[PDB]
Design a protein around this nucleic acid. Structure first.
Ligand SMILES: [Cl-]
Ligand SMILES: [Cl-]
Ligand SMILES: [Cl-]
Ligand SMILES: [Cl-]
Ligand SMILES: [K+]
Ligand SMILES: [Mg+2]
Ligand SMILES: [Mg+2]
Ligand SMILES: [Mg+2]
Ligand SMILES: [Mg+2]
Ligand SMILES: [Mg+2]
Ligand SMILES: [Mg+2]
Ligand SMILES: [Mg+2]
Ligand SMILES: [Mg+2]
Ligand SMILES: [Mg+2]
Ligand SMILES: [Mg+2]
Ligand SMILES: [Mg+2]
Ligand SMILES: [Mg+2]
Ligand SMILES: [Mg+2]
Ligand SMILES: [Mg+2]
Ligand SMILES: [Mg+2]
Ligand code: NA
Ligand code: NA
Ligand code: NA
Ligand code: NA
Ligand code: NA
Ligand code: NA
Ligand code: NA
Ligand code: NA
Ligand code: NA
Ligand SMILES: [Sr+2]
Ligand SMILES: [Sr+2]
Ligand SMILES: [Sr+2]
Ligand SMILES: [Sr+2]
Ligand SMILES: [Sr+2]
Ligand SMILES: [Sr+2]
Ligand SMILES: [Sr+2]
Ligand SMILES: [Sr+2]
Ligand SMILES: [Sr+2]
Ligand SMILES: [Sr+2]
Ligand SMILES: [Sr+2]
Ligand SMILES: [Sr+2]
Ligand SMILES: [Sr+2]
Ligand SMILES: [Sr+2]
Lengths: 237, 56, 92, 194
RNA sequence: GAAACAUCUCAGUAUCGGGAGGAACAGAAAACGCAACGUGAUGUCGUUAGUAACCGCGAGUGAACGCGAUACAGCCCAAAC
RNA sequence: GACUCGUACGGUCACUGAAUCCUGCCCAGUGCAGGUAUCUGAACACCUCGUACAAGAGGACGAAGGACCUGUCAACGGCGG
RNA sequence: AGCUUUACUGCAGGCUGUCGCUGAGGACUCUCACUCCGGGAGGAGGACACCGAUAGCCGGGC
């Protein structure tokens, strides 16, 4: 047959790439020698093309102008701080260890100093639960309990733009405009509507997969389609 | 629209041009590579054994 | 069919009739050092292995008798043509 | 009496024991951070180098080359192939790794010519060889009774034509009798069946 | 091609990558093994021979030593001191 | 290297195809997934035999997998005499 | 010839054991290779993983 769509993706051709040249900034936490003597002032609030969420332009004491992953409630004029001694208010960043348990956090680092990896999407937040000299337990937006180095930095508050998902797209055109700002091929043609040569589910005198949809984890690319390694399917039971 | 005559009307693009190195009108001005002598692709001159019969 | 475990018959070795004992031929064990064994190793490689990619044929509905006839006096055995038999049980 | 060289030689018979072992475990850490072809001022295995033709003279160069370990890095067929020719994983190249190293070295020094080479160990994923190259244009060499032979025109690019020591062995020319029916005088003249 | 076909065959062919010369390559035995009280670097030509050997032991594949010729040529390092 | 200047309110893989009222029963087979006393399960190393060595025969241990058990149909599908 | 599959035979790919890289004191500790994070100091991990080799299972993706 022919390579399936998921295989055309990996080649990274124009159709599948993100409009990077149109993206604004890589919102990573600032690096600080130590002390925490790093504060800045929110100079503006901008739209982030890559996340459909607002972002904040901050001007730091040492002349550094950079965009920041904004939590809800940050406005122009507000003063933010980054460092071990940073105050414990929304919008400020400090290592998990300095954060009080029971406080909502966002843009959490995986490995200390990586600039943040977890909880960065609209309206989400991680929940700092347990402290320690060895591990800081955090509850991520998926509900999973993540053990982290207490040295991993994080921003206080929930990410801005919450509730974005509450409104339906209503029409294809709205989806269209959003998809144009992402690394995705859209619209989506169902495999069952294709020819046998183009997909494992293609072919037939009528539309229906010609095998069970639950595919093994070990299936090779070109065949791994449908419900990947499903532990179960449906809603019942 | 027919793929034949009607689609020939839009052909006003210049691609292959006189090559600085070999003189043939094969220097693709968009690719900057000569399809005839290889200029722009290789210092060595484009040549293949299949350009002639095997025993010759 | 039934068949006597012992009986008088010609011994091609003694060259005279004597009591023989009949036994079913037990399969001898292979060594894996015969020429064919080395050829299988030598010739099997990437892709199909010709004759070495074939698998065991089928079965005839009935097999022929496969026996050894041992002379009770000189101890040497001899073989004979077998005959188709669904089952073969020795008497005693 | 034993020459000092004999001691270097004896140490390398077992690169995994004694002081040499500790040395390698140390060096390789640096080697792994070096490039593909690193010119070095002095041979790591002096006895071996001198034994192969090396000389502390002008125009004599030494370079250590690292090449990946293992079989051929081959792409799977993209057209029809009978089962016998569909392999990928078990296919190995016909040139040994030491020969690949000699070639990468010679390319780095276009003006020089490969004299010989030898192994200096390997780790889990790569092998290192030091190659001895000679400047056929330097008068210090053109006047050397033991090396000036490498200055002849027919010795140009000798490594790429398999005229090297590793080249001749890899071409099955070691034996003068039985077994070399299709290797001598050349693989090509014998229909490529060596 | 094997009157299908998978090993085999076409064939290390076609084609591709790299490189030298006027010719290349080979080459002074850790050889041969007409087993010898024998030969004596290496190409090549004739022959040995469709022999030995390989092979769904199918179709097919296929040398060498030797011999008769051509031309002949034998040396330099590493180390010991 | 794409996804990705992205991080679960994400994005990948699929099915259905606005709204409204709804979406029953079946896990035996096939698929996926989890578990597993016991059974089965290759090579290396190891033990026995064999060989002054080797080929080879056998044993012990036993990974994933399978047997076995469980979950699962808005999973392939089924809902008869 | 294109396509399919519990047709025949194989080939990628995934999973898994083993050998090498690979070190110190049937469950365990460590640091020194190696890996990752950090501008750096240093932190995390660690003889595993990656990679090379091989073995078994799955394997119309080809
Ligand atoms: Cl979306
Ligand atoms: Cl019988
Ligand atoms: Cl060279
Ligand atoms: Cl003779
Ligand atoms: K063929
Ligand atoms: Mg960012
Ligand atoms: Mg787009
Ligand atoms: Mg669709
Ligand atoms: Mg259609
Ligand atoms: Mg298909
Ligand atoms: Mg339908
Ligand atoms: Mg349908
Ligand atoms: Mg020749
Ligand atoms: Mg045929
Ligand atoms: Mg036949
Ligand atoms: Mg042949
Ligand atoms: Mg001979
Ligand atoms: Mg056909
Ligand atoms: Mg990195
Ligand atoms: Mg097919
Ligand atoms: Na063979
Ligand atoms: Na060179
Ligand atoms: Na050969
Ligand atoms: Na035919
Ligand atoms: Na045919
Ligand atoms: Na054959
Ligand atoms: Na004679
Ligand atoms: Na069922
Ligand atoms: Na067709
Ligand atoms: Sr980042
Ligand atoms: Sr960064
Ligand atoms: Sr179908
Ligand atoms: Sr249900
Ligand atoms: Sr035009
Ligand atoms: Sr170019
Ligand atoms: Sr050419
Ligand atoms: Sr073979
Ligand atoms: Sr095989
Ligand atoms: Sr039968
Ligand atoms: Sr050249
Ligand atoms: Sr002579
Ligand atoms: Sr509806
Ligand atoms: Sr089931």
């Amino acid at each position: 047959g022919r390579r399936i769509q998921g295989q055309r993706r990996g080649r990274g051709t124009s159709t599948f790439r993100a409009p990077s040249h149109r993206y604004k900034a890589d919102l990573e936490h600032r690096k600080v020698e130590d002390g925490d003597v790093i504060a800045g002032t929110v100079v503006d609030i901008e739209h982030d093309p890559a996340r459909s969420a607002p972002v904040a332009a901050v001007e730091f004491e040492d002349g550094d102008r950079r965009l920041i992953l904004a939590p809800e409630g940050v406005g122009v004029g507000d003063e933010l701080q980054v460092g071990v001694s940073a105050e414990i208010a929304p919008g400020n960043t400090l290592p998990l260890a300095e954060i009080p348990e029971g406080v909502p956090v966002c843009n959490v680092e995986s490995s200390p100093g990586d600039g943040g990896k977890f909880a960065r999407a609209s309206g989400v937040n991680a929940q700092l639960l347990t402290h320690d000299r060895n591990v800081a337990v955090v509850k991520l937006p998926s509900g999973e309990m993540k053990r982290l180095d207490p040295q991993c930095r994080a921003t206080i508050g929930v990410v801005a733009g919450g509730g974005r998902t509450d409104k339906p797209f209503v029409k294809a055109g709205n989806k269209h405009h959003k998809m144009k700002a992402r690394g995705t091929k859209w619209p989506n043609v169902r495999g069952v509507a294709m020819n046998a040569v183009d997909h494992p589910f293609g072919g037939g005198g009528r539309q229906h997969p010609g095998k069970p949809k639950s595919i093994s984890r070990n299936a090779p690319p070109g065949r791994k389609v449908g419900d990947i390694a499903s532990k179960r399917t449906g809603r019942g039971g | 629209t027919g793929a034949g005559t009607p689609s020939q009307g839009k052909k006003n693009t210049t691609t292959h041009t006189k090559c600085r190195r070999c003189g043939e009108k094969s220097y693709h001005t968009k690719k900057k590579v000569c399809s005839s002598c290889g200029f722009g692709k290789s210092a060595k001159r484009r040549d293949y054994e299949w350009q002639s019969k095997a025993g010759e | 069919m039934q068949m006597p475990r012992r009986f008088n018959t010609y011994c091609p070795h003694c060259n005279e009739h004597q009591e023989h004992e009949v036994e079913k031929v037990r399969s001898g064990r292979q060594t894996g050092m015969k020429w064919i064994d080395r050829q299988r190793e030598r010739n099997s490689g990437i892709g199909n292995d010709g004759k070495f990619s074939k698998v065991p044929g089928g079965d005839k509905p009935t097999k022929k008798t496969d026996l050894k006839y041992r002379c009770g006096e000189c101890g040497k055995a001899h073989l004979r043509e077998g005959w188709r038999a669904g089952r073969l049980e020795f008497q005693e | 009496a034993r020459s000092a060289y004999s001691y270097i030689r004896d140490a390398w018979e077992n690169p995994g024991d004694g002081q040499l072992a500790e040395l390698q475990w140390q060096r390789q850490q640096e080697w792994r951070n070096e490039g593909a072809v690193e010119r070095i001022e002095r041979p790591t295995r002096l006895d071996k180098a001198r034994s192969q033709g090396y000389k502390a003279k002008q125009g004599v160069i030494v370079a250590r080359v690292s090449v990946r370990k293992g079989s051929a890095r081959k792409r799977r067929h993209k057209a029809g192939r009978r089962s016998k020719r569909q392999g990928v994983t078990r296919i190995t190249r016909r040139k040994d790794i030491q020969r690949v190293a000699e070639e990468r070295a010679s390319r780095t020094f276009p003006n020089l010519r490969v004299l010989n080479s030898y192994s200096v160990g390997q780790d889990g994923r790569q092998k290192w060889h030091e190659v001895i190259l000679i400047d056929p244009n330097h008068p210090a060499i053109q006047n050397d009774d033991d090396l000036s032979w490498i200055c002849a025109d027919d010795q140009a690019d000798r490594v790429f034509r398999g005229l090297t020591g590793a080249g001749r062995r890899n071409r099955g020319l070691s034996g003068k009798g039985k077994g070399s029916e299709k290797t001598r005088p050349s693989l090509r003249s014998n229909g490529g069946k060596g």
